[PDB]
Design a protein around this nucleic acid. Sequence first.
DNA 1: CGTTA
DNA 2: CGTTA
Lengths: 138, 138
Amino acid sequence: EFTYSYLFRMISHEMKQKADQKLEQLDITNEQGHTLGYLYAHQQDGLTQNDIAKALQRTGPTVSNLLRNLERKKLIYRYVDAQDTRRKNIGLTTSGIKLVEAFTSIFDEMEQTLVSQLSEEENEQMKANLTKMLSSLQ
Amino acid sequence: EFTYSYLFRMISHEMKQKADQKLEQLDITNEQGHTLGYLYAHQQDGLTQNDIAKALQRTGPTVSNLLRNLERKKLIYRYVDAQDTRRKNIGLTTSGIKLVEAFTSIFDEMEQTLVSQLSEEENEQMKANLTKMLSSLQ
DNA sequence: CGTTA
DNA sequence: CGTTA
């Protein structure tokens, strides 16, 4: 009944939907999620609003609003740079980190769900076949 | 070796890549493709630049530039509305239509490629299993 | 987004 | 986009 194109598109759609749904359960928007995820990946650096704006490709006022909201939840903290009064550095709080890790947990959760649908032998065959299909598109 | 998450993501990636590649062969950008596709879907209406801007969620100057380029190739034509001097209607030319249909042909082409990778019996099983996996995410 | 980009 | 959103 279904074409492969429909199935692959729909599977991807639902995987995205699950992620969206996880963000909703954590009371954050997609964009807030992206901001926190980028902070997570660059915790070591000492990031500013401008860095985030460039990375997310969003205007300054938009990132200011996002950060204001994230800080109001204390998922982030901001402080004046000791060498530059005009610069505010941004970090994740303990809870910010926990929220990001809770969000990203959904990837393995979905993998585990997909894997549990088939017998071990069926999974091996399915992966082989998907691997062949993937090759045929390359 | 590969997770299902990697395979489904990569298959979707390549399918998108094939579409991009088709646009390149037809000498149009993604955005130009989107504009022509929207015109195709609304050939019956008498569309203006403003309609297209709202639909594509792009600024007016951007759509003006897109239309200028599409018209320079004569993939579209524009004319002053007989009831409103300030309004220009936009239509696809014969070649504009042919280009869109050539682009969208790539969907069935990829479906046919995917289907040809497996025996008939294997395709039935694969589709069944993908259908189960899709359900498990719903 | 148009259609499944 | 961060990581696979």
